[PDB]
Amino acid sequence: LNPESADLRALAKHLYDSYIKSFPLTKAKARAILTGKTTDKSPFVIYDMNSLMMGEDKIKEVAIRIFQGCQFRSVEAVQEITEYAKSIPGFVNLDLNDQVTLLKYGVHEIIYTMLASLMNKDGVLISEGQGFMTREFLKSLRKPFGDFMEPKFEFAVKFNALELDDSDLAIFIAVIILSGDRPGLLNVKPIEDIQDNLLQALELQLKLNHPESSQLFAKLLQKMTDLRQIVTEHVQLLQVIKKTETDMSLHPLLQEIYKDL
Incomplete structure (x- = not known):
């Protein structure tokens, strides 16, 4: 209970608040749907061609239509993260080219x-x-x-x-x-300097919220290695698609984000 901590908790509360306001599908909700909670309703399940076409109401070639559907969802997701980014204190005060x-x-x-x-x-x-x-x-x-x-x-x-x-x-x-x-x-x-403040906030968050989870902070940070890797793998797959399906189109917002990666 002290001045330095209190400021980190408040940054934590602030980010939690903005995250809830920016991402409509939270992990809390997602876990309730996936486990069977009565707070949320049951998902229709697609596991094959027929269930696919079936669900295709409430919910070209199949593989493509799924890839296209995912492209559009990634775009929405970018927009959402973009809105969330703006709330991170100091972010909008940075050089525009760097924000981008x-x-x-x-x-x-x-x-x-x-x-x-x-x-x-x-x-x-x-x-x-x-x-x-x-x-x-x-x-x-x-x-x-x-x-x-x-x-x-x-x-x-x-x-x-x-x-x-x-x-x-x-x-x-x-x-x-x-x-x-x-x-x-x-x-x-x-x-x-912003990131150091954020890392400080995470460190305190992880220790209050998971007091019995040892070096979770360190363990969480290690995960960046796995993220980088699946990103690079992803773009390679994209290069392959560009060469083979010359009739399929990548969303331009994704074309920019994907270039030079």
Whole structure:
């Protein structure tokens, strides 16, 4: 109970608040849908062609239509993170070119961190939690569309092991955004000062919220290695698609974000 801590708790509360206001599908809700809670309703399950076409009401070639549906959802997600980023104190006060640069490299890592929230070993919530597509049906998509998801599932299973709640993630994704080590950053220093404050806030958050989870802070930070990797793997897969499906179109907001990665 003291002045330095109190300021970190308040930054924590502030980020939690903004995260709830920015992301309509939280982990709390996602876990209630996935486990069977009476606070949330049951998802329709797509595990094959027929269930797919079936669910295609409430919820071109199949693999493509799924890839397209996911492109659009990633775009929404960028918009959401973008709104969330603006609330991180100091972020909007940075050089505009840097804000843009932080977002460009930050969004993917965050998208996959939060996607974890919507995943269990067996599948992933879709359509705002109304649906659930099985890992097996995704992995069964024709090449190379059947390769996109597995890495993410593998990450999520291990990331979800940490048992983080929304209030921990609010801070963690803030730390991810304010990475001073991003290529082409004009003024790295004010970024690192924000991030140090965020890391301070996470450290205290993780220790109050998970007092019996040893070096969770350290363990959480290690995960960045896995994020970087699935990002690079992702873009490679994209390069392959560009060369083979010259009739399919990548959303331009995603084309910018994907270039130079």
